């Protein structure tokens, strides 16, 4: 096939309003407004075009591991070492709290205005009803702490990665495990869904990525190198699924080629670890945060 | 008016100091996730004790990468679990994310150790102090300090202390050791080294 070739991108905007390290970020469905979370107990909603802070929310607990943006744009969420999921209304008032987990909250994703899916470090996931504020289902297959999750485009399934070198697929309606994949040697840090919804990618501490196809039930590609001896903190796909972007602990992000599986680019502009990484809904820009307290937008 | 509030909160942020509290169940670290706040000489310290999680710490420990110091409490009167505490300290010291963080080591329960001595490790036979209680105290301290000095000489330092149950000077010690840590940082930051 025709290789992608060198992929050169440069920082367009830089967002500087956070005091501590960035731990998570998420984009809005409008492809303009994004929410980011910092360990200094602040939740800022930015404007990429102008870099103006639309909002700023002080959180009760300083250590937040994740944040989410409602697909309708009327709410947000976040959580961490407090073992709660806090949901804020954007009429900003704390509208609710979801408290059923036992370990720290690792990830969360809105299904609707009324439902949200969460994972915790107690090795379980759960589906909530926001109006009633109680769990509806639990998913209890994993053996190690769940680190990431990713909702399917139809919103009827999802995959989760755990600190056991394995992944699993769940039926939201049925609440039963469908499959299991074991290709890695150490903890899984990130997981993503391919645009078509029939695959996913995974980054681990053994310093490799791998691509799993649900129908074949086996790892297809293995994105590694002989000189990379660090783990992977985040992954993300592009609009077409042709470039896989992965952040590392070497302070740089690499732009892999999902099919040819040979690195095609690098984004070296952060002085510390690259923690979070997201791609816009309409595929126009890429945002990356780091432990340097700065957010950068690349095009 | 977001910018003014953010500037004020940034000014507030660097004024206070964070701490992480570590230890075992038998170590009376609670009397030395909960939040504690105290003040010495008009400087504010915030100490955090994490107890709502499972017994695997290799992932949520990374949240405390940029803390000022770590407080490690040891129950020194129990010979059985002393090797477990040594292994815990060795794991903490050599972590990649805690390589720049200084450790304040508290060797608690000194009265119990004295009582036990007056009533595991074979190298204690050919040991001499740098009277039995003094030898045991410094033997355990040096057991920890061998691990401390075996690596990471330039980057960070370990401050040892002997603590009893009725001690009331722990806050002063944390204040002084944090002052020294900050002096090291300023030394490296103002072109002096």
């Amino acid at each position, epitope marked *: 096939i025709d290789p992608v070739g060198r992929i050169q991108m440069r920082t367009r905007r830089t967002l500087r309003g956070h005091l501590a390290k960035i731990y998570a970020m998420h984009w809005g469905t409008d492809s303009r407004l994004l929410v980011s979370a910092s360990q200094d107990g602040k939740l800022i909603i930015w404007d990429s075009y102008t870099t103006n802070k639309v909002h700023a929310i002080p959180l009760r607990s300083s250590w937040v591991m994740t944040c989410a943006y409602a697909p309708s744009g009327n709410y947000v969420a976040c959580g961490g070492l407090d073992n709660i999921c806090s949901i804020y209304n954007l009429k900003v008032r704390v509208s609710r709290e979801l408290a059923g987990h036992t370990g720290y909250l690792s990830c969360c994703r809105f299904l609707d205005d009324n439902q949200i899916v969460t994972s915790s470090g107690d090795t379980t996931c759960a589906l909530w009803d926001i109006e009633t504020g109680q769990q509806t289902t639990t998913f209890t297959g994993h*053996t*190690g702490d769940v680190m990431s999750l990713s909702l399917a485009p139809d919103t009827r399934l999802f995959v989760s990665g755990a*600190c*056991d*070198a394995s992944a699993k697929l769940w039926d939201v309606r049925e609440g039963m495990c469908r499959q299991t994949f*074991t290709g890695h*040697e*150490s*903890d899984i840090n990130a997981i993503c869904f391919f645009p078509n919804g029939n695959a996913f990618a995974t980054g681990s*501490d*053994d*310093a490799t990525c791998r691509l799993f196809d649900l129908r074949a039930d086996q790892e297809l590609m293995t994105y590694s190198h002989d000189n990379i*001896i660090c*783990g992977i903190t985040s992954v993300s796909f592009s609009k077409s699924g042709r470039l896989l972007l992965a952040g590392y602990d070497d302070f740089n992000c690499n732009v892999w080629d999902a099919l040819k599986a040979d690195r095609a680019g690098v984004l070296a502009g952060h002085d510390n670890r690259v923690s979070c990484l997201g791609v816009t809904d309409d595929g126009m820009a890429v945002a990356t945060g780091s432990w340097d307290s700065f957010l950068k937008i690349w095009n | 008016g977001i910018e003014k509030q953010l500037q004020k909160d940034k000014q507030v942020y660097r004024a206070t100091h964070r701490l992480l509290l570590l230890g075992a169940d038998n170590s009376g670290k609670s009397t030395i996730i909960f939040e504690t706040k105290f003040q010495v000489d008009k400087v504010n310290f915030h100490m955090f004790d994490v107890g709502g999680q499972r*017994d*695997e*710490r*290799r992932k949520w*420990i990374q949240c405390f990468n940029d803390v000022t110091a770590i407080i490690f409490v040891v129950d020194s009167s129990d010979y059985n679990r002393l*090797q*477990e505490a040594l*292994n815990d300290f060795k*794991s903490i010291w*050599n*972590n*990649r994310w805690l390589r720049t963080i200084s450790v304040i080591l508290f060797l608690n329960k000194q009265d119990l150790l004295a009582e036990k001595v007056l009533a*595991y*490790f*074979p*190298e204690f036979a050919r040991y001499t102090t740098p009277p039995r209680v003094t030898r045991a105290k410094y033997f355990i301290r040096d057991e920890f300090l061998r691990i401390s000095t075996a690596s990471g000489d330039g980057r960070h330092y370990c401050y040892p202390h002997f603590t009893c149950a009725v001690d009331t000077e722990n806050a002063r010690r944390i204040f002084n050791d944090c002052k020294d840590i900050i002096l090291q940082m300023n030394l490296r930051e103002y072109n002096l080294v």
Partner: nanobody, 115 residues
Framework: QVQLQESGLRLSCAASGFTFSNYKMNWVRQAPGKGLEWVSDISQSGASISYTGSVKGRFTISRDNAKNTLYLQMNSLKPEDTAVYYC???????????????????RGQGTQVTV
């Protein structure tokens, strides 16, 4: 899919599903009615070796990367050594936290040793 299978007095560990040489190995026992206790470790290349004081001078450890196996040459045992012995592999390569954990995912099923 990692898997550590032990056998065995000279104990031998069989490792599968990963590179053997880039990791630091350990020896973890579990005496009856007590928690898991660390015994011996050996670095990647087999240079640095450390022991619990109890088995100092008695148990000899050596790793064989070529055959991908770990040994604990033990002699002059005591009744206090009766326990289950597990083979542990702390997770990160090129570098050891949760080995003696209640539910650690990277250690074998173990072999019961009775003296």
């Amino acid at each position: 899919q990692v898997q550590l299978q032990e056998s065995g007095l000279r104990l031998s560990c069989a490792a599968s599903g990963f590179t053997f040489s880039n990791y630091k190995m350990n020896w973890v026992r579990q005496a009856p009615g007590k928690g898991l206790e660390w015994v011996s470790d050996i670095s990647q290349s087999g240079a640095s070796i450390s022991y619990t004081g109890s088995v100092k001078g008695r148990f000899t450890i050596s790793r064989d990367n070529a055959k991908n196996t770990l040994y604990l040459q033990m002699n002059s045992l005591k009744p206090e050594d009766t326990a289950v012995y597990y083979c542990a592999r702390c997770p990160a390569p090129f570098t050891c936290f949760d080995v003696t954990s209640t539910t650690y995912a990277y250690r074998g099923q173990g072999t019961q040793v009775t003296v």
